[model samples]
Target: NIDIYNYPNEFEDNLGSISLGDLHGNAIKLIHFLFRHKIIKFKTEIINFHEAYQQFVTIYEQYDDMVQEYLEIRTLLQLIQIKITNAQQRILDIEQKLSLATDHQKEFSQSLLQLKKPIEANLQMAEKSKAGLEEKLSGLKTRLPSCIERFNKFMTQIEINDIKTLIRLLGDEVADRGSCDYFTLRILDFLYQNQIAIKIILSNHGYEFIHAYEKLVVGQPFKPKGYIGDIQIKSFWGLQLLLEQSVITEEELRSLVERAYKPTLKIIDYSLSEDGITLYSHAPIRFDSIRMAASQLGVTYNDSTKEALAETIDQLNAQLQIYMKNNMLHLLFENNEINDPTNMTDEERNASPLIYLVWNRWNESKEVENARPGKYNGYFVTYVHGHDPFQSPLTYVYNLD
Candidate 1:
């Protein structure tokens, strides 16, 4: 450090010694940099250096930032002052010009008085608010575990074993899209219940943090329940380093998984042209949930289709409830006219899809695609609407409600 000091005579030759042009514009940042111990360069900022030098660098940077801000307002103040001065001078010229008229005639004097009155008001108004140039300018990263891994998926644009993973992920995604919230809430509740540490950190605004890392990553996500977008597990990590000093890594979160409180019964799922589905009304058996779940699912009798679409889904879901009460078998093979079960054929099973399940919305609006699940079935369960995916297989007694 002593050798770097300059000699009075050598100053001229050393003028160019202030290299580090790469970081030149941010010199204080350089001081903030090289002053740290070399060991930390490899460690990153997991911890910061401490000392008066470090303190001064931090404070100095803040001071310089404020200086820049101060310069801006001061510069703007001068601009406003200059503009006000110019306006003041213009008023002076107007008043001065008025006197030059040398005519005391009532007609000219009266008009001058009126104009001057408004001018005076404006002149004092510079101490202002209320509009003008004020209107002119107005403006305004995370990985927890792979939730994919939480469920295990990998539909990438590039992958070998990757392709198989992607295919399976989308398969389960659409299949259980309806149960998405259930699974998510289940996992969320699981994490909260089992690992309060992880839960506390997550619920503490870490939703978007972990969300961004996975979402910011590749575009493909499990199709289950619209991939649990922007949720709040009661109003719910790795990219956590930003809003959080919590630099907990993805691996840390990855270790968080280990099946617990998982599904007791395997949900065999599928897809269908079940746009053949519609709504109606439920209740009975402890009934709060039964009543709420069923009633919530039925939105209305569209004024036009006043009859719940001829009881299509009203009855469609009825069997589901009935099936759930019985444990002998579980199947959801209803799609369009003569659309009842009791037959098995190549044409009959061609159905729609959910070995290839997707989401809801069909016919004209055609959003949230039904994507023809060719054949296969489970529960087209989803929260797409409030009663979405039509809970195809009410085969499990009040399971999700």
Candidate 2:
């Protein structure tokens, strides 16, 4: 009924020519016809039966190309997503390992810090103690040899066997509560200066520097005095100083003395006898008595004083030699060789009664005089034991000179 192409324009013109009342009655039909004709015109222009097959073929070929492009793009997207997931997993693993390594590093650092302080403190303490040890060792090693040589020279020059002999005799007899002389003190001074330990030397030499000597009584076992009474004597104060310095322990020293020597032998026995003035005293006289004798003689009363007084009495015996040798009036005067009165024998006592009596009276008078503090001038004597034992005694004049 309509020429599809040319009639399409005429149909639209006809529709517009219709009256409103007429169009309203057929409005629905007219709208449908308009749509159908427009569709037919669109189809005819786009593709007629002849070109329909060729158009479809071109479209199919374009669709296949588009499908190939879509497949390539989707494959690329999936690969990108997989790569991102793998990267995230690696990052997570790295983070975990980094956290663990950082914690270990922190712990190791903390451990090192903990060890550092005590090590530093120990090093400091070792250095300080080492310095002190070196100082002490230097004194012993460097100064001791010179000090010992000097001491030997001094002993040799003096040529007095007294000091060495007395030192040697320290632990050979009963200990005494006695003072130390200047010579003895000089020896101690040398040892002190050299940092030599007296106790160690004494111990090495099998000698004991005992603190004190106990009282000796007849019919009683000997009991040596302890160190508690040692400082009571002037000489023992040096020993006390050594004790304070920790050079020696009191107990060990006491033990050394106790083990080495025995009590001195009983030198004298007193009994009422018809022959002599009855000496009337037992053995074991106090050292104070001898000191008193030295003082009465107006002499230096010290450790050597006993020996000096003993020698002076021997001189008196020499003066009375004719009478002693003749044995005339032996009751009044003594004539006999007496060694150490401290260790005199019973026979010596009986033979030296008058001499002993005179010695006793002189000591008593000296004790009395010492107790008195008066101005009295008198000559006193100190006999020096000569360097040569064979040499005659050298008398030193005191007070009067």
Candidate 3:
């Protein structure tokens, strides 16, 4: 019964002598316990034994350090978990308290309204009675000093140059740069980045604004003209997914290059997709999809292809402004108040009927659009308002009843 070899080497060495039958008996007991509890069939008990033995070996040697580290990490994780649970519970408790407090406030508000009702009614009656009382007391007394004090207070609040003083006190950042000229464009770029929205008053320079915009916002630096077709934007959109997955494949680069090779690819039309669903244009299938197809006749990029689509992520957002605005121009102007030529109200006023331009360039589409040249289309949104006569007019009125 005392067969020590059945035990693990480490355990047996430590214990000196142990019985094998006792283990066999324990095994029998466990098997019976499983059978009794319907855990597994008695005939397949080796599966359980193998799993248990492997686990035992792991605990004994192979995973001892890792297990200890795991336990320590687990303990800290459990503590943090407990704290998070408690914090959430506390937040729930505070929410409940807030709910109760809100109800109490509502009740107090109602009670206050109820208390004021009778007082208000009584005050109205007292006002009428005071009129009669005033008729009888008119000859009694006059506080001339109180009248003088009230007049002085009223006079202190009046100022004839209040408007001019307000204008003088205003800061420079309050207005927007309206024109699309080089200087105005630079100023607008800076202002927009700073999140400062202001009025840009361009009266007779509206035509010049249009021409300048065609170059600065739409055309590439070299070509100051309109673009031909789709403008390829390096899916700064796809760049995020690429970064998450940590590499683009040879096939991807080949396919992207092939798109550029295709003669029909428009500079304005983009092959846009999110979550792998291509919306506007068709993308060639890869081996993964081709292999899955019932008829696997489609082409697949060879693994030996040299390039992975080199990173296309940069200040794509800034470059995309005009592209996005092209579609968004009408809506922008419709919602804004434009400036008038005759009126000199404010320093600058927003333009109405926004005109937007997006630069899209393939090497061949429009050399002007070459600023954002790639395989896909680019676009933008712009807003141009109608002229304001008073120029930069701001009307502020408080009508209270």
Candidate 4:
């Protein structure tokens, strides 16, 4: 019955592995054993059927105490609230009637012109009675709702206090299983996800037309000008946001930093005039002390790991020289590089090759973590630029600004 209308057939299949006909037969035997021993009183034709009936009865008995407690407490509190309200209302009605009687007494005593100071004093006493009764009634009105809520909330707290521990255990068990078929909903559910995304308006910069609430949120982001001189910083900014929470485990984050260094180096400027048969390698560093104090989060160097790092840089330089030379020669032999800017179209002037250095490191070192002097990690990317045998073509650091 519990399995009826289930969306996942696999869930039922897995449960079936733990439940078989032999287990059910054994369960039936246990039920009859309890009955024969006078532990339960159940009517059944067969021993197996009797055993199953006793099993269900025994399980139900354990939960019966909890069920009764919940119902009894809820009912008692509801009754108490109704009784408190009615008693207070009765006090108010009596007070109002007493005030009416006192006013009538004053008018009659004055009309008779009896020397009646005693009658006036008695009328004032009835008014005083109304005031004292109202004070008691008003005090009760303020205290009743708070008392009821506190009683109900106490019961709710008791019901849930033990269940919170069980939930945390289930989360850890699921993660430890590590099954590919297992799916987890472990994202930062509320606040952190919101903090990672940013929004911008073009109107702030004088363009004047960005507020349809068409709202570019995440995945799609706007690139603002003025950080890197000419390059777009949006891609790098987006990457940082995505990995903000992922840097917790040192080894895993270090590997990711090493992989990211290759692409970053290609985007920086290079000069071929420096002599290189000399070797160069790329290395990445995590300057946490500097990260804590200033603007960048991490820095990568390509030229520090090994001699191969230096050699790889030299190889890239040689390949770049040949690629650029072919282009340079083609300009002299065919397309005119010397054409007047006034005579040529803007597109023609801007046309150029996408040539840049690419690298292939034969091996990578393990991520090394450092804490002294500054928080520096040992696992770094190593590669060379045309001029510097010891400098990274691009530094892998966080932009704190």
Candidate 5:
């Protein structure tokens, strides 16, 4: 018999409803034909129905086992193909990432090479520049003090008269009342500047030009031998003395006072009114031509030369009080010779109005206490310089008995 399991029902449809082990019709016919033709034996042995059925069962079991094994092999092949495809995609991805990393490394290496020389050169230049500056600074430190010393020595050697003349020229350029006014303004400027340069000159050199210029300007040469000894002046007598010397006319004095001292008219008004008179010495007679010129200008007044001096001195004293009330005085001397001639320099005494006024009063009394009767009656005038209280000729006057 052929192995039925090998051909198990695969061709059953072509067999015309032949059951699994049923050989009734076609089998019997085919067997008879084969016997008649003497092609094959009819049946060497007859098989029972039970044995045929058992043979079919065994063939079916074997076929089923082969189908299951084939299906398992196909499923395993599909799983392996999927794993291979995934591994191919992962390799491609890794190649792309490695290409990008190579490009980045190349760019970084090129940039580092490009920056190296310039960065090194910059650091070297900076060090060179720093060293140059350090060398220059060392030279400056070495030379600066010597240069300063030379500058100071040169400045110290400059003559005061040269400075005076230079300053005089400067003042003369804008002088309102000629050289006297120029000198007055210049001295006031120097005083205002704290007299640093002039003080330097005074310390090193003698006070020759300073003394002469001061005497010609605001010095105490007004009343040489009167009750008022060497008194300081409110205004320089140089211009007036020049006029009195006939170098200039009385009309010029009137004109100058009108311009320089605009309050001359008010002084005249107060003097004529008598309300401005006081016991102290009145205004100075510096304005002698004021009344004479006033008489001509129709601002009339009547007084002798002596009476006018007294009147003017009273006005001057009032003005002096105002001047003292307003500003600061720099004292240059302190002589306590009350009973005898004061040893103070006339230039020092005349350096300021306060010094002139106080020194005169101190000379008149020779007493530190009760020097004068009224304002300075119970008090005596002292002297000071600059802002020094204990040694200031100014504070000395203010510091009473």
Candidate 6:
């Protein structure tokens, strides 16, 4: 058999055509050669052509069935090999993950070693303090009341003059004029920060400071006054007395004003014209525009100072208005029976301006109080050591009316 179709049967008649009886290993030695895949169906002999032809036809049909079955089995084996390779890859990934987990466990051991020292030291320190802390807690319980008793005793011993001198020192420190430029800058700072908080509210607390300039007007006696946060201060306080008793004369005040004005414009435009001085109190448009130009026409700190200068001018006008109204009689003491009369003067009044700073304290309530501070009900004597507000001589309360 030439085997042109490549049938798997090795057994074939010498005529090269398959005989059914030989395919099942009966007529030829092909049974020994292809017997493993061969199906066994035997015939003892084929005596006639009719019978041989029938077997011949049967052999061709049988050969094809084996060919297809073997092909299907080979494909199934190939697929099984693919499934085994996929399983090995998954196992390899799992091995790497297990190694990573072990490394993390080792790292945790090192972390615990680092944490052990400080924790043990702190534990030892706590244990060592047990006996001393117990003794201290007992002693302090009794000692606290004794300390509070001494606190009460020192209060009556301190004379009013001790407080007067202390307040005098602070009065010298507060900035009150734009001639120094703090007044202008402080306003700008207030305006900027005002945006963050809903509004600049007032705190209820008040502080009293000396009118350090009182010495110039009143000789030995001073004004008994309080600088409070709740009150709106538009002008210099005690101005009527400053002019009548002495900021000496209106002429000296003019000198102070002009001197301050020149400095206000020195940085704005190197030169100052008479028109600039005349329009200064009213509009001041020209100078601020020039300053804004210097600031590259930007909205920033330099520009804010220019805007703040307007507030200073309004303050100056309000201060001057008091003297112009000739309302000096109200401020004078026919009896001089004021609260703190140790002393204040006119030159000192001009030296400091009445400035109410409530903007900053209002914002502080956010962290300390989470809301605005207490209502503006009364004044208190600020102190490192002093009496409490209740039943204390250092407190005074009244509405604006």
Score residue 74 of candidate 6 by CA lDDT: 32
Which residue runs does candidate 6 get wrong by more than 4 Å? 1-118, 130-141, 154-167, 171-401
Pairwise lDDT winner, candidates 1 and 6:
1
- TM-score per model over all chains: 0.23, 0.20, 0.15, 0.15, 0.17, 0.16
Best by lDDT: 2
Supply every candidate's count of residue pairs whose N, Cα or C atoms clash at under 3 angstroms.
Answer: 22, 1, 45, 35, 19, 12
Ranking by lDDT: 2, 5, 1, 6, 4, 3
**Candidate that beats the other on lDDT, 2 or 6, i.e. the better one:** 2
**Tens-digit lDDT string for candidate 2 (284-307):** 122234333333333454333333
TM-score, candidate number 2: 0.20
Model 3 TM-score on a 0 to 1 scale: 0.15
Better of 1 and 3 by lDDT: 1
**Root-mean-square deviation of candidate 1:** 25.3
lDDT of 3 at 208: 27
RMSD after CA superposition, every candidate = 25.3, 61.6, 36.4, 29.5, 62.7, 50.2
Give one digit per residue, the lDDT tens place, for model 4 in 159-194: 111111100000111101111000111111111122
Q: Name the regions of candidate 1 deviating beyond 4 angstroms.
A: 1-18, 30-49, 75-79, 128-401
lDDT of 3 by residue, 1-401 (tens): 22221222221121211111111112222222222222222133234534443432332232223223323443454554555565455545545655565554876656555655554565455455545534433221132223224333422322221111100000111111211012112222332333332222211222222222333333332121121110111111122112223233334432332222111111111112231111110111111221111111122322121111101111222222333335222232222243432221222112221111110011222113322222222222111122112121112111110
Q: What is the C-alpha lDDT of each candidate?
A: 0.27, 0.30, 0.24, 0.25, 0.29, 0.26
lDDT of model number 5? 0.29
Output the worst ten-in-a-row residue range by lDDT, candidate 2.
199-208
Per-residue CA lDDT of model 5 for 1-401, tens digit only, reads 33322212221111111101111111122222222322222132434533433443343233233323333443454554555455445445544555555544876656554645454455455455546544643433353334324323422322221112111010111111111322222222322233211111011001111222323235343211112211121113222233333444555444433333222112222212222222211111112223332332233344443355445544643442343233211122222432322233434333332223322223322433332221222222222111111221322232211
Q: Give lDDT: candidate 6, residue 73.
A: 40
Worst 10 residues of 6 by lDDT: 161-170
